[PDB]
Design a protein around this motif. Structure first.
Motif, PDB file in Angstrom:
ATOM      1  N   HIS A   1       0.877  -1.044   0.042  1.00 65.14           N
ATOM      2  CA  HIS A   1      -0.003  -0.030  -0.082  1.00 65.14           C
ATOM      3  C   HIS A   1       1.097   1.207   0.111  1.00 65.14           C
ATOM      4  O   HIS A   1       1.880   1.252   0.503  1.00 65.14           O
ATOM      5  CB  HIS A   1      -0.667   0.038   1.382  1.00 65.14           C
ATOM      6  CG  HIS A   1      -1.868  -1.055   1.318  1.00 65.14           C
ATOM      7  ND1 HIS A   1      -3.119  -0.898   0.737  1.00 65.14           N
ATOM      8  CD2 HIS A   1      -1.871  -2.197   1.970  1.00 65.14           C
ATOM      9  CE1 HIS A   1      -3.460  -2.161   0.984  1.00 65.14           C
ATOM     10  NE2 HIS A   1      -2.930  -2.921   1.654  1.00 65.14           N
TER      11      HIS A   1
ATOM     12  N   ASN B   1      -8.306  -9.936   3.829  1.00 64.61           N
ATOM     13  CA  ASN B   1      -7.748  -9.368   4.947  1.00 64.61           C
ATOM     14  C   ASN B   1      -7.178 -10.603   5.904  1.00 64.61           C
ATOM     15  O   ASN B   1      -6.213 -10.545   6.714  1.00 64.61           O
ATOM     16  CB  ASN B   1      -8.573  -8.480   5.904  1.00 64.61           C
ATOM     17  CG  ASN B   1      -8.615  -7.103   5.520  1.00 64.61           C
ATOM     18  OD1 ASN B   1      -7.361  -6.381   5.240  1.00 64.61           O
ATOM     19  ND2 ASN B   1      -9.772  -6.483   5.379  1.00 64.61           N
TER      20      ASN B   1
ATOM     21  N   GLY C   1     -11.708  -8.291   1.546  1.00 63.37           N
ATOM     22  CA  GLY C   1     -11.884  -9.583   0.735  1.00 63.37           C
ATOM     23  C   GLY C   1     -10.604 -10.571   0.810  1.00 63.37           C
ATOM     24  O   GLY C   1     -10.721 -11.880   0.895  1.00 63.37           O
TER      25      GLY C   1
ATOM     26  N   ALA D   1      -7.184  -4.616   2.964  1.00 61.20           N
ATOM     27  CA  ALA D   1      -7.830  -5.015   1.733  1.00 61.20           C
ATOM     28  C   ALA D   1      -8.774  -5.829   1.805  1.00 61.20           C
ATOM     29  O   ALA D   1      -8.653  -7.288   1.875  1.00 61.20           O
ATOM     30  CB  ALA D   1      -6.653  -6.005   0.924  1.00 61.20           C
TER      31      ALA D   1
ATOM     32  N   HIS E   1      -1.942  -3.652  -3.732  1.00 58.18           N
ATOM     33  CA  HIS E   1      -3.479  -3.530  -3.263  1.00 58.18           C
ATOM     34  C   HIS E   1      -4.074  -3.587  -4.629  1.00 58.18           C
ATOM     35  O   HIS E   1      -5.346  -4.210  -4.766  1.00 58.18           O
ATOM     36  CB  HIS E   1      -3.580  -2.125  -2.711  1.00 58.18           C
ATOM     37  CG  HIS E   1      -5.033  -1.889  -2.024  1.00 58.18           C
ATOM     38  ND1 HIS E   1      -5.356  -0.820  -1.509  1.00 58.18           N
ATOM     39  CD2 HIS E   1      -6.109  -2.688  -1.982  1.00 58.18           C
ATOM     40  CE1 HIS E   1      -6.582  -0.788  -1.034  1.00 58.18           C
ATOM     41  NE2 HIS E   1      -7.109  -2.243  -1.457  1.00 58.18           N
ATOM     42  N   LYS E   2      -3.982  -2.979  -5.795  1.00 58.44           N
ATOM     43  CA  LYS E   2      -4.456  -2.941  -6.931  1.00 58.44           C
ATOM     44  C   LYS E   2      -4.586  -4.074  -7.740  1.00 58.44           C
ATOM     45  O   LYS E   2      -5.419  -4.486  -8.720  1.00 58.44           O
ATOM     46  CB  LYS E   2      -3.901  -2.024  -8.098  1.00 58.44           C
ATOM     47  CG  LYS E   2      -2.394  -2.295  -8.430  1.00 58.44           C
ATOM     48  CD  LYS E   2      -1.681  -1.455  -9.422  1.00 58.44           C
ATOM     49  CE  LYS E   2      -1.740   0.141  -9.202  1.00 58.44           C
ATOM     50  NZ  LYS E   2      -1.333   0.603 -10.524  1.00 58.44           N
TER      51      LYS E   2
ATOM     52  N   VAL F   1      -5.745  -6.917  -6.126  1.00 56.58           N
ATOM     53  CA  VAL F   1      -6.668  -7.625  -5.367  1.00 56.58           C
ATOM     54  C   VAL F   1      -7.892  -6.617  -5.290  1.00 56.58           C
ATOM     55  O   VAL F   1      -9.186  -7.328  -4.864  1.00 56.58           O
ATOM     56  CB  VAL F   1      -6.212  -8.011  -4.044  1.00 56.58           C
ATOM     57  CG1 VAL F   1      -5.074  -8.871  -4.182  1.00 56.58           C
ATOM     58  CG2 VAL F   1      -5.895  -7.049  -3.039  1.00 56.58           C
ATOM     59  N   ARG F   2      -7.954  -5.385  -5.486  1.00 59.74           N
ATOM     60  CA  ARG F   2      -9.163  -4.505  -5.399  1.00 59.74           C
ATOM     61  C   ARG F   2      -8.890  -3.408  -6.496  1.00 59.74           C
ATOM     62  O   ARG F   2      -7.774  -3.183  -7.009  1.00 59.74           O
ATOM     63  CB  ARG F   2      -9.094  -3.765  -4.040  1.00 59.74           C
ATOM     64  CG  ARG F   2      -9.107  -4.879  -2.945  1.00 59.74           C
ATOM     65  CD  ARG F   2     -10.709  -5.015  -2.667  1.00 59.74           C
ATOM     66  NE  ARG F   2     -11.438  -3.846  -2.002  1.00 59.74           N
ATOM     67  CZ  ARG F   2     -12.722  -4.051  -1.648  1.00 59.74           C
ATOM     68  NH1 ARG F   2     -13.521  -5.073  -1.868  1.00 59.74           N
ATOM     69  NH2 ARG F   2     -13.170  -2.952  -1.125  1.00 59.74           N
ATOM     70  N   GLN F   3     -10.074  -2.915  -6.970  1.00 58.06           N
ATOM     71  CA  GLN F   3      -9.960  -1.552  -7.889  1.00 58.06           C
ATOM     72  C   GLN F   3      -9.462  -0.362  -7.200  1.00 58.06           C
ATOM     73  O   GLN F   3     -10.231   0.037  -6.202  1.00 58.06           O
ATOM     74  CB  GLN F   3     -11.179  -1.457  -8.487  1.00 58.06           C
ATOM     75  CG  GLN F   3     -11.675  -0.365  -9.637  1.00 58.06           C
ATOM     76  CD  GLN F   3     -12.496  -0.259 -10.293  1.00 58.06           C
ATOM     77  OE1 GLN F   3     -13.542  -1.205 -10.305  1.00 58.06           O
ATOM     78  NE2 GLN F   3     -12.926   0.981 -10.501  1.00 58.06           N
ATOM     79  N   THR F   4      -8.458  -0.054  -7.460  1.00 59.50           N
ATOM     80  CA  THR F   4      -7.574   1.175  -6.592  1.00 59.50           C
ATOM     81  C   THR F   4      -6.478   1.687  -7.429  1.00 59.50           C
ATOM     82  O   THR F   4      -5.971   0.746  -8.389  1.00 59.50           O
ATOM     83  CB  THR F   4      -7.417   0.990  -4.910  1.00 59.50           C
ATOM     84  OG1 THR F   4      -6.633   1.990  -4.610  1.00 59.50           O
ATOM     85  CG2 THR F   4      -6.483  -0.376  -4.870  1.00 59.50           C
TER      86      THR F   4
END
Ligand SMILES: [Zn+2]
Length: 149
Positions: A27, A80, A78, A76, A124-125, A127-130
């Motif tokens: 992150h 964590n 989903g 994160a 992070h991007k 595993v997630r939209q960011t």
């Protein structure tokens, strides 16, 4: 063993220790100049127990502990329950990791990888939209120095 600076926190809500990490997620903080205590305050506002990252690496390379190493974090949703979260101070859409942050990223990552038998490194991007951890975050260089493919 990397130097981890212990921080006194007062956790708002009960920590879960049903944490079985098999992943490290990287992150960025976006905001600069934040102490771990300031991150903890913000994360409490968002309804988390406190600082959601397991580690926070400041620009001078100092590694602060956040969440306990055996507790589920809040970094994160989903993954964590399966992921360590390692935050670096900065907005890496607009600057670069310092040499001291890179040194600490490699040392901390290898410590956790060896201690927990982890080979899976993710942004992070991934595993997630960011946009986190920022365009310039040196993910491929970290993987290369750690001999991860
Ligand atoms: Zn993130």
């Amino acid at each position: 063993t990397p130097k981890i600076v212990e921080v006194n926190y007062t956790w708002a809500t009960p920590l879960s220790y049903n944490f079985n990490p098999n992943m490290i997620v990287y992150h960025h903080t976006v905001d600069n100049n934040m102490t771990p205590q300031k991150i903890d305050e913000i994360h409490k506002q968002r309804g988390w127990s406190g600082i959601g990252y397991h580690f926070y690496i400041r620009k001078d390379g100092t590694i602060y502990r956040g969440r306990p190493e055996n507790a589920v974090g809040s970094h994160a949703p989903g993954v964590n329950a399966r992921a360590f979260g390692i935050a670096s101070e900065g907005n890496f859409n607009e600057e670069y990791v310092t040499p001291q942050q890179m040194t600490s990223l490699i040392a901390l990552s290898r410590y956790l990888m060896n201690k927990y038998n982890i080979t899976d490194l993710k942004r992070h991007k991934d595993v997630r939209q960011t946009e986190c951890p920022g365009n310039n975050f040196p993910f491929e260089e970290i993987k290369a120095k750690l001999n991860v493919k």
